[PDB]
A paper describes a structure:
Cytochrome c oxidase (CcO), the terminal oxidase in cellular respiration, couples O2 reduction to proton pumping. Mammalian CcO is located in the inner mitochondrial membrane and accepts electrons from cytochrome c on the P-side. The protons used in H2O formation are supplied to the enzyme through the D- and K-pathways from the N-side, whereas pumped protons are transferred through the enzyme from the N-side to the P-side in order to generate a proton-concentration gradient (ΔpH) across the inner mitochondrial membrane. Bovine CcO is a large transmembrane protein that exists as a 420 kDa dimer in its crystalline state.
Owing to the pH sensitivity of the crystallization conditions of bovine heart CcO, all previously solved structures of CcO were determined using crystals formed at pH 5.7. Because crystallization conditions for bovine CcO under the proton gradient have not been established, we sought to determine the structure of CcO at neutral pH using crystals prepared using a mild detergent, in order to obtain structural insights under physiological conditions. The mild detergent FOM enabled the successful crystallization of CcO at pH 7.3, as in the case of the cytochrome c–CcO complex at pH 8.0. p.i.m. and I/σ(I), as well as the completeness and averaged redundancy, indicated that the intensity data were of high quality at a resolution of 1.77 Å. All of the water sites in the Mg-containing water cluster are in almost the same positions as those in the corresponding states at pH 5.7. Following our previous paper, we determined the occupancies of water molecules in the Mg-containing water cluster, and found that the total occupancy of water molecules was 21.15; this number is identical to that of the low-pH crystal within experimental error. Residues 112, 114, 115 and 118 of subunit IV (Q in the PDB definition) interact closely with other molecules in the pH 5.7 crystals, whereas in the pH 7.3 crystals these residues make no contacts closer than 4.0 Å. Residues 93, 94, 95 and 98 of subunit Vb (S in the PDB definition) made intermolecular contacts within 4.0 Å in the pH 5.7 crystals, whereas these residues were disordered in the pH 7.3 crystals. No decyl maltoside was replaced by FOM, as in the case of the cytochrome c–CcO complex crystallized at pH 8.0 using decyl maltoside and FOM, which was likely owing to the lower hydrophobicity of the fluorinated tail in comparison with that of the corresponding hydrocarbon tail. No structural differences between crystals obtained at neutral pH and acidic pH were detected within the molecule.
Numbering used by the authors:
A (entry chain A): 1 to 514
B (entry chain C): 3 to 261
C (entry chain G): 1 to 84
D (entry chain L): 2 to 47
E (entry chain I): 1 to 73
F (entry chain D): 4 to 147
G (entry chain B): 1 to 227
H (entry chain M): 1 to 43
The structure:
């Protein structure tokens, strides 16, 4: 029975739970790696070793946080749990293929662990640029194991994307149009389209790196007429859509959380929110070269990428202001989930704005490959994607488990994390403006103060992470079973109780057309 | 008892075996590339084939034998196949991008020209043109097969499908021979790199597509398909047209324009 | 374009068979004859050790590590030239 | 068929809070420890 | 005693919003006026003043005499 | 009074200031005296005592608006506990400094910094605003 | 170079860096305005017991939410692109210098007239002379004439590097097989520091750049002495 | 949300144990590795 | 003819950050010129400008590698 | 040219596919493929909601093009009203 | 009936605050952390050459 | 050939509680056991290979 | 759009329906409090008389609580509404939340 249920699953909820567990474990790995980075940088000098061991840690940090924590939690976890419930579907379109998307991840993670254990690891950056990632400067198996890890993660998400798109288009009640589906469902569908289009280009690029490394091809090797910069185009053609993939399900959860704890039946400006997510998804495919402003592109190309990048502020602003208008006139419930969402709206705005600073190719000359970029992305990731994840986790934990968290503990957890992440990342703006490069194990003495403070911030974040584990334990230890949940009339995922039965919507909802 | 039309699938081990097969093939390639051993890779390929066989076998059992493919389930599979094909188009797009990047701006190492100094391209009017006529012809014969099936004609469906498969095989053998005869190799700089990786992945897709057609052929022989319900054949035909179109782009880009 | 053919009364099996045997396969037969006339060995290119060709950054995972997968002794020189 | 309800829709037991604590400790603790031991591993090589 | 006068009872949220959004705007103008003055204009003036009578050769001679250069003693 | 898990699909009671009249009465089962009270409610409400009026309210509703809206001392616990754990974090940092971090580079020694500072002034590091601009080259001291 | 507790950009040493400072000031003002407006409106939404929970009409307000940000973006883009095109203008250099990135050091070539080339390595911490900067000093500085337009050409002979000097507003990637061009013009004599700005392996942190800006006549004699 | 009182209440003492064990599970192994860095770096 | 050569002037054929082709073209031009001057028995000194320009622009290792390959008979450019 | 040998759905469809096919021929929708058409939704003319049990979830799109759907359990017995628009629904079990 | 916050809130606030400030002040000033503050108005420049 | 689809429909619709991957009979069980054994054994071997490759062989 | 007077009149008519049922009373009040207004005394008067016809004393008290709540920080609104309703409260024997001690936390 255990194997049948947990290894052979064809159930969207159980697979959702597997993904949440996997993502939680990965989060611990990613957190350890983040603390190793900040320990190395926490005082001037060398702690661990030179830049090789250091950048193996940095590289793994990024891959684990992105591919093994954020995507599996948002898309695999919340997507699988919530999407079928929110459309009254009995499961996913392809419930068996769904299970393979999950089971591809532990092998993917194993390959990443292998990469760091063999030889001297892959100290390449998560971007894996040649020639540093090539077979001369990174001889041996590490980079190949990284490539294969990405292949498996890629297939997992591509098949997942096919599953979500099909489920969302095909398995709604016959009376429900796409414009009657909740915003989270939209956010997953758009994210899935981005995955479907972007990941195959990454797969092509890393395969070309694999053949340069092992079959004597020269896609990226000038000796054979190749070009290192071609790799960068292929990677970033995926890499920009990837960050919109990381944030979109977050936007979707934020819309639900803000609506719910404002005591509203609906988000402000629903069709505007749909429009904004589609616009952001589209614009996210035509901007990749803003990651390449210093490689030596022609000026008109730089002008175009500056402008196309900035334009994304418009639909994004529509969402930010619509969240504010959702709060407007709300009966505000100051739940821990609400706190995460409020933190998200503000801190994501800050990170989005520093993104707009970076979109300016002229200024990006000085900011590129500095800590200013690191500050920008941790605002939208550690204080954006992660805040949405924590908000969603706290909000829906009672649905998934049938048990309540201690709200006071969860508020304490939020407070600690909020202080920690801001202390970690805010000073990195100063480090970036003043010229501290990325991927350094050590820095000129002038940079000591802000690195010291940033590292102290990372330790505060650690305490929050450890507390989170205890809080989850306390909930399962005490067993306070859910009784009533407000606003079920506009939150269908709750309507089958907590937890919902293994099989829900065996009899579909009745929705007439009028 | 359900009162929706969707398919609740029996708990299955094939997702786990497929995932593990992926681990074995990738760790196996690593072992082959670095530790001079083919063992892991062979086990991985074996378990992958076992997984695919049993998984798709079960889909046949669920549909032909058990009746779980209602119109709504079939519609889902249509979307699934279309989306899969889209992902495959984007995969090839990455290789076309690599080709155009290298060929449109040939570096000094190549002699600053395309084709590079020392490269002697195949004549696009010779076997590459033959290959083109072969896959185009197979697009015609597969369409004949589809109409025969819809019209309930078992014999002509089988004959047309056989012809389509024979053409797929002919293309594959022609490409195999062209690979052997080619005076340039995968190691001949970016010309060899783009040529063999792009046409090579295409060749693999022709082999996959031909295999799919063969599966359909034997299912047809076993009377699985009705005149109205035959999505496996439709999916194989779509995939086949995809393979044809990729070839046409390769022919125009690499063989013709790139010569 | 309207191709140059005709019909369009009803795209059915009979029409697609007509196209298969009347256009598609004859085209293949013609291209096969064409290829069979331009067949035979093209002269072996004189060897020049160009550094952008015969790339070796890592030995191949088969044979002696120095031979490409579909190595043809007649037309594929090694980095050091044609085989003896 | 399968057990339904709070504490039953999960692949781990919550029947005993102390056994649960041990399992969660091993689970999250192994994840957090791994990078430190990989660093140790890399340092001990050369 | 005397009766209580009728107070405003409708649109209390909207009235509060109208009043405060202006305060959100009137602040921004006040800050901009300040920020342009305290940071941006100060910077323009700092650079303008520095270079107005700047003597690069004199600057070099001071650096040279301080012994900072490899190329000049 | 007693709410059951298996009642999830049935209309339920809630105290929410934005939903003043919930879908069900707080108390549906009535004792002999409570039955008599509901009968008495059909006659003039002026005849009901204050106690009877309160009892009728408490059968219909669980908490009053004043009760459900009450403030709490929770903030004290949240802020206090957060500060405690932030405080605990400093213990980890003290441990790290003592047991993990070795000496920092000699370039932070007081004399080195004094000399390095002069050299930075000699090369006129950031002479417009940032650094040397804050040094008085005529008076040979930091500007006031 | 950066100094302790620095908040912003290193002081501008070139006119283009001056332009970048003023453009950053302009953009940051806007960033501060929007961030504070959002924070304020958040606080406003959250500080009243008054409620309005029925359906709110959206189309009026969305006009403001799209048009005002569009205008703000234009007001950023206008000076942004002015500077971009200024950086691209023809200027006529007096001198061309090449730099090649290596693991882990820079080489420099001044081959307009003579074959002058040399390597430039970080001074190890143990070998710093009193007052010298940890991780920043080099053995052989890039001596250049001040107040002159210099063409810098950047490439690599191994992996990616990137050649940066923040106070001149410079960062040009060093890519094998590629010759990237930037212009350098210092308004002042002095020493101007930078660091490798692409991850390039074990000593990425430890291959800095030091420019030494001096009068032409001094540059000429130094050049001759380096043959 | 409303919920039942805890089926198996976790007292302050029990919470202190859970919290302490949780923190130690993160701190002790990492602490061990970091304490011994010099020992590894001399190999 | 035009001495007091300082450095390679702006070339409108190569106005962008990528100057690879500029180095390459001038290297080709010089050696093409000197070959055409030797074939007709003329003066190589008319080619000097191309030499100055490519010497200014081209990395030493590129020139050295190209010179080696011309001597080896493996230079892939047409001269 | 043109013989037979290919089975039809009538001959060979089985299981749920066959049930759906045969029901559709009778103008019946036991597997909820079609959206039900609304009545006037008054108490005299309530929307009739089929079910195989004693409760079913209703989603009410109160006005045409509302993006918000209002969800509630409809139980066996007296007609219930949408909590947003008041339209009447009545369960008809089996 | 007083809840946890009524009974212990004051003490948790007071103790948490006192502990946090005390331990952070100690860590910041007593264990040899080099903050590397600005030399401006602090360091007397010394001859280096 | 003859149409035996009806026979297979009867087989795979037998009310015996077997999951589809085992409903064909004993041969399903064998092929399943072979597949799982190769997967699990192969995975164990991959971990051995990782252990081997994690350390130098000078 | 409709005037304030027309809005008020619709709501008075809603609650004045002689045979208004319990569901419609709740629907009315729960919808009304969603708006950006404290309901006019005439609306509240009609809702209180509906409570009387439905023999529901508790809901009458709860309606008075909602009025106070909808005023938020505008402390002058509730005492004015109660003042205006006093004849109705006296007529129907409706005690205010304050008279019942239900304003105590
Ligand atoms: C979830 C992750 C995420 C998200 C959502 C984003 C969002 C954005 N990012 Fe970011 N980014 C990263 C993660 C992300 N980024 C990462 C990881 C990197 C580094 C990759 C690497 O090298 O490793 C990076 C790098 C990166 C660069 C490269 C800098 C460099 O390397 O030199 C740039 C430059 O254009 C950029 C820009 C933007 C922009 C314009 C947005 C926009 O989408 C933001 C839009 C949002 C707002 C603007 C705020 C809300 C709007 C309003 C309140 C309206 C009013 C506003 C205005 C009028 C401006 N990002
Ligand atoms: C999602 C992405 C993500 C996240 C969350 C983080 C989080 C953190 N990151 Fe990271 N980082 C990256 C992605 C991310 N990072 C990337 C892409 C790079 C660039 C890599 C490169 O240069 O190649 C990078 C680089 C980077 C650097 C620069 C290295 C260098 O240039 O030398 C630093 C240095 O301080 C840093 C630090 C931190 C810290 C202290 C945190 C902390 O905020 C983390 C604290 C802990 C958490 C946020 C908890 C995580 C766990 C969960 C949320 C699990 C819970 C589970 C459930 C709810 C089910 N990161
Ligand atoms: C009719 C064509 C059919 C192709 C069948 C050939 C067998 C290889 C397998 C096919 C897969 C194709 C792509 C892999 C890339 C390389 C093979 C390219 C096709 C090919 O076969 O190229 C040959 C070289 O093959 C070589 O290196 C040997 C390569 C063998 C090892 C394969 C390496 C595995 C790479 C893993 C791919 C990763 C897939 C990722 C999936 C994406 C996930 C989202 C050409 O021979 P040559 O002697 O150099 O020149 C001819 C001279 N007379
Ligand atoms: C050299 C070898 C290494 C490479 C590995 C790949 C090998 C080749 C495998 C070739 C693919 C064979 C697929 C066979 C699928 C048979 C199952 C099937 O076709 O199932 C059909 C459903 O379609 C469905 O699932 C649709 C099923 C779609 C399958 C898609 C196939 C493409 C997979 C390609 C693998 C990706 C590799 C890409 C490389 C980058 C069943 O429904 P019907 O047909 O309507 O029947 C029912 C009627 O009888 C009722 O009256
Ligand atoms: C980045 C995240 C890390 C945050 C920092 C962690 C906080 C510290 C947790 C405690 O860790 C322990 O510290 C002890 C020292 O206090 C070590 O004992 C060491 O020192 C003792 C004496 O000092 C000896 O008894 C032991 O043998 C010797 O292992 C012990 O191994 C280690 O587990
Ligand atoms: Cu050279 Cu980083
Ligand atoms: O990517 O931003
Ligand atoms: Cu981007
Ligand atoms: Mg870079
Ligand atoms: Na360090
Ligand atoms: Na068909
Ligand atoms: Zn309705």
């Amino acid at each position: 029975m255990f194997i049948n249920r947990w290894l052979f699953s064809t159930n969207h909820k159980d697979i959702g739970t597997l993904y949440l567990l996997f993502g939680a474990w990965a989060g611990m790995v990613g957190t350890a790696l983040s603390l190793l980075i900040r320990a190395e940088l926490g005082q001037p000098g060398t702690l661990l070793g030179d830049d090789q061991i250091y950048n193996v840690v940095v590289t793994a940090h990024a891959f684990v946080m992105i591919f093994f924590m954020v995507m599996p939690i948002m898309i695999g976890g919340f997507g699988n749990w919530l999407v079928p419930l929110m459309i009254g579907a009995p499961d996913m379109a392809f419930p068996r293929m769904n299970n393979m998307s999950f089971w591809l991840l532990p092998p993917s993670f194993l390959l990443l662990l292998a990469s760091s254990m063999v030889e001297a690891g892959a100290g390449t950056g998560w971007t894996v640029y040649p020639p540093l990632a090539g077979n001369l400067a990174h001889a041996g198996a590490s980079v190949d194991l990284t490539i294969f890890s990405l292949h498996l993660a890629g297939v997992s998400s591509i098949l997942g994307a096919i599953n979500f798109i099909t489920t969302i288009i095909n398995m709604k009640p016959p009376a429900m149009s796409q414009y009657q589906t909740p915003l989270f469902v939209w956010s997953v569908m758009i994210t899935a389209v981005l995955l479907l289009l972007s990941l195959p280009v990454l797969a092509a690029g890393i395969t070309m790196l694999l053949t340069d490394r092992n079959l004597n091809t020269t896609f990226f090797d000038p000796a054979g007429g190749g070009d290192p910069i071609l790799y960068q185009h292929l990677f970033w053609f995926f890499g920009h859509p990837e960050v919109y993939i990381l944030i979109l399900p977050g936007f979707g959860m934020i819309s639900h959380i803000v609506t719910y704890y404002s005591g509203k039946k609906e988000p402000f400006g629903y069709m505007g929110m749909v429009w904004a997510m589609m616009s952001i998804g589209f614009l996210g495919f035509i901007v990749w070269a803003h990651h390449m402003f210093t490689v030596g592109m022609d000026v008109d190309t730089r002008a175009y990428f500056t402008s196309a990048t900035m334009i994304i502020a418009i639909p994004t602003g529509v969402k930010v202001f619509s969240w504010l208008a959702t709060l407007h006139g709300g009966n505000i419930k100051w739940s821990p989930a609400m706190m995460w969402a409020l933190g998200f709206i503000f801190l994501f705005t800050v990170g989005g704005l520093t993104g707009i600073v970076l979109a300016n190719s002229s200024l990006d000359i000085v900011l590129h490959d500095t800590y200013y970029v690191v500050a920008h992305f941790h605002y939208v990731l550690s204080m954006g994607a992660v805040f949405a994840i924590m908000g969603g986790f706290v909000h829906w934990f009672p649905l998934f488990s049938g048990y309540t968290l201690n709200d006071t503990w969860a508020k304490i957890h939020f407070a600690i994390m909020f202080v920690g992440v801001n202390m970690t990342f805010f000073p990195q703006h100063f480090l970036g403006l003043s010229g501290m490069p990325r991927r350094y194990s050590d820095y000129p003495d002038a940079y000591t103060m802000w690195n010291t403070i940033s590292s102290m911030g990372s330790f505060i974040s650690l305490t929050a992470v450890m507390l989170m584990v205890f809080i989850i334990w306390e909930a399962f230890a005490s067993k306070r079973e859910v009784l009533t949940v407000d606003l079920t009339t506009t939150n269908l995922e709750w309507l089958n109780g907590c937890p919902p039965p293994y099989h829900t919507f065996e009899e579909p909802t009745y929705v007439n057309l009028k | 008892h359900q009162t929706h039309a969707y398919h609740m699938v029996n708990p299955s081990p094939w997702p786990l075996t497929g995932a593990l097969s992926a681990l074995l093939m990738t760790s196996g390639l690593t072992m082959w590339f670095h530790f001079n051993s083919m063992t892991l890779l062979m086990i991985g390929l074996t378990t992958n084939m076992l997984t695919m066989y049993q998984w798709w076998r079960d889909v046949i059992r669920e549909s032909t034998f058990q009746g779980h493919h209602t119109p709504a389930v079939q519609k889902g599979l249509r979307y699934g196949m279309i989306l899969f094909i889209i992902s495959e188009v984007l995969f090839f797009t990455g290789f076309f991008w690599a080709f155009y990047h290298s060929s449109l701006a040939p570096t000094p190492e190549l002699g600053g020209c395309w084709p590079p100094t020392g490269i002697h391209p195949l004549n696009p009017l010779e076997v590459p043109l033959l290959n083109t006529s072969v896959l185009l012809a197979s697009g015609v014969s597969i369409t004949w097969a589809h109409h025969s099936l819809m019209e309930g004609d078992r014999k002509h469906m089988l004959q047309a499908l056989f012809i389509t498969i024979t053409l797929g095989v002919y293309f594959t053998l022609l490409q195999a021979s062209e690979y052997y005869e080619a005076p340039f190799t995968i190691s001949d700089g970016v010309y060899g790199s783009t040529f063999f990786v792009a046409t090579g992945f295409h060749g693999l897709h022709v082999i996959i597509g031909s295999t799919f057609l063969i599966v359909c052929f034997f299912r047809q022989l076993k009377f699985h398909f009705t005149s109205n319900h035959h999505f496996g054949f439709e999916a194989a035909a779509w995939y086949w047209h995809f393979v044809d179109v990729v070839w046409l782009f390769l022919y125009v880009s690499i063989y013709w324009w790139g010569s | 374009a309207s191709a140059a053919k005709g019909d369009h009364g009803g795209t059915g099996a009979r029409t697609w068979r007509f196209l298969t045997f009347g256009l598609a396969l004859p085209s293949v037969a013609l291209c096969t004859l064409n290829s069979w006339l331009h067949s035979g060995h093209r002269e072996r290119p004189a060897f020049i050790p160009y550094h952008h060709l015969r790339i070796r950054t890592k030995p191949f995972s088969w044979g002696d590590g120095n031979h490409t997968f579909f190595h043809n002794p007649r037309v594929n020189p090694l980095p050091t030239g044609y085989e003896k | 068929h399968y057990e339904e309800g709070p504490g039953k829709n999960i692949p781990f037991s919550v029947e005993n809070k102390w056994r649960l604590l041990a399992m969660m400790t091993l689970f999250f603790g192994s994840g957090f420890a791994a990078p430190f031991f990989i660093v140790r591993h890399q340092l001990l090589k050369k | 005693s005397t009766a209580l006068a009728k107070p405003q009872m409708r649109g209390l949220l909207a009235r509060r919003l109208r009043f405060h959004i202006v305060g959100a705007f009137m602040v921004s103008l006040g800050f901009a006026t300040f920020y342009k003055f305290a940071v941006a204009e100060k910077r323009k003036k700092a650079y303008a003043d520095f270079y107005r009578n700047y003597d690069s050769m004199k600057d070099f001679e001071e650096m040279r005499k301080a012994g900072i250069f490899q190329s000049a003693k | 009074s007693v709410v059951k898990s298996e009642d999830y699909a049935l209309p339920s009671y809630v105290d929410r200031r934005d939903y003043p009249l919930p879908d069900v009465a707080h108390v549906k089962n009535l004792s002999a005296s409570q039955k008599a009270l509901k009968e008495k409610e059909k006659a003039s409400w002026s005849s009901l005592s204050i106690d009877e009026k309160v009892e009728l309210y408490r059968l219909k509703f669980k908490e009053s608006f004043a009760e459900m809206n009450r403030s709490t001392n929770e903030w004290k616990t949240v802020v206090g506990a957060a500060m405690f754990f932030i405080g605990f974090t400093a213990l980890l940092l003290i441990w790290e400094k003592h047991y993990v971090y070795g000496p920092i580079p000699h370039t932070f020694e007081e004399e080195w910094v004094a000399k390095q500072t002069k050299r930075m002034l000699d090369m006129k590091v950031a002479p417009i605003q940032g650094f040397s601009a804050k040094w008085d080259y005529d008076k040979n001291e930091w500007k006031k | 170079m950066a100094y302790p507790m620095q908040l912003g950009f290193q002081d501008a040493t070139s006119p283009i860096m001056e332009e970048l400072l003023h453009f950053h000031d302009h953009t940051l003002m806007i960033v501060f305005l929007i961030s504070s407006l959002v924070l304020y409106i958040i606080s406003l939404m959250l500080t009243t017991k008054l409620t309005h929970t029925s359906t709110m009409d959206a189309q009026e307000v969305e006009t403001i939410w799209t048009i005002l940000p569009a205008i703000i973006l234009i007001l950023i883009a206008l000076p942004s692109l002015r500077i971009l095109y200024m950086m691209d203008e023809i200027n006529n250099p007096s001198l061309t210098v090449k730099t090649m990135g290596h693991q882990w050091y820079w080489s420099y070539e001044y081959t307009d007239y003579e074959d002058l080339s040399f390597d430039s390595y970080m001074i190890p911490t143990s070998e710093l002379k009193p007052g010298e900067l940890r991780l920043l000093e080099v053995d052989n500085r890039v001596v250049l004439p001040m107040e002159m337009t210099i063409r810098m050409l950047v490439s690599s002979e191994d992996v990616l590097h990137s050649w940066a000097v923040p106070s001149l507003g410079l960062k040009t990637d060093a890519i094998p097989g590629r010759l990237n061009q930037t212009t350098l013009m210092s308004s002042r004599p002095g020493l101007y520091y930078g660091q490798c700005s692409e991850i390039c392996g074990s000593n990425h942190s430890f291959m800095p750049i030091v420019l030494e800006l001096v009068p032409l006549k001094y540059f000429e004699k130094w050049s001759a002495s380096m043959l | 949300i409303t919920a039942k009182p805890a089926k198996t209440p976790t007292s302050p003492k029990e919470q202190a144990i859970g919290l302490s064990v949780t923190f130690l599970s993160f701190l002790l192994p990492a602490g061990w590795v970091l304490y011994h860095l010099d020992n590894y770096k001399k190999s | 003819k035009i001495k007091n050569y300082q450095t390679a002037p702006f070339d409108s054929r190569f106005p962008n950050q990528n100057q690879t082709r500029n180095c390459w073209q001038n290297y080709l031009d010089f050696h093409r010129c000197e070959k055409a001057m030797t074939a007709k028995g003329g003066d190589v000194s008319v080619c000097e400008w191309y030499r100055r320009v490519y010497k200014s622009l081209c990395p030493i290792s590129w020139v050295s590698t190209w010179d080696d390959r011309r001597a080896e008979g493996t230079f892939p450019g047409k001269i | 040219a043109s013989g037979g040998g290919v089975p039809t759905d009538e001959e060979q469809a089985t299981g749920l596919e066959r049930e759906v096919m045969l029901a559709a021929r009778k103008g019946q929708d036991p597997y909820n493929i079609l959206a039900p058409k609304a009545t006037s939704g008054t108490k005299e003319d309530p929307n009739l909601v089929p079910s195989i049990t004693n409760k079913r979830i209703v989603g009410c799109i109160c006005e045409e093009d509302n993006s918000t759907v209002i969800w509630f359990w409809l139980h066996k017995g007296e007609a219930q009203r949408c909590p947003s628009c008041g339209t009447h629904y009545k369960l008809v079990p089996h | 009936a007083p809840d946890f916050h009524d009974k212990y809130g004051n003490a948790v606030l007071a103790s948490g605050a006192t502990f946090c400030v005390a331990v952070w002040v100690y860590m910041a000033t007593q264990i040899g952390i080099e903050w590397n503050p600005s030399p401006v108005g602090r360091v007397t420049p010394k001859e280096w050459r | 050939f003859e149409n035996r689809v009806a026979e297979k429909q009867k087989l795979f619709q037998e009310d015996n509680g077997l999951p589809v991957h085992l409903k064909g009979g004993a041969t399903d069980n064998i092929l399943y056991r072979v597949t799982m054994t190769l997967c699990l054994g192969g995975t164990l071997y991959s971990l051995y290979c990782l252990g081997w490759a994690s350390f130098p062989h000078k | 759009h409709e005037t304030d007077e027309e809005f008020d009149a619709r709501w008075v008519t809603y609650f004045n329906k002689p045979d208004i049922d319990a569901w419609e009373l709740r629907k009315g009040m729960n919808t009304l409090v969603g708006y950006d207004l404290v309901p006019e005394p005439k609306i509240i008067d009609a809702a209180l008389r509906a409570c009387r016809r439905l023999n529901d004393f508790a809901s009458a008290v709860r309606i008075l609580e909602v009025v106070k709540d909808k005023a938020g920080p505008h402390k002058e609104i509730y005492p004015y509404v109660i003042q205006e309703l006093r004849p109705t409260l006296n007529e129907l024997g409706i005690s205010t939340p304050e008279e019942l001690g239900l304003d105590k936390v």
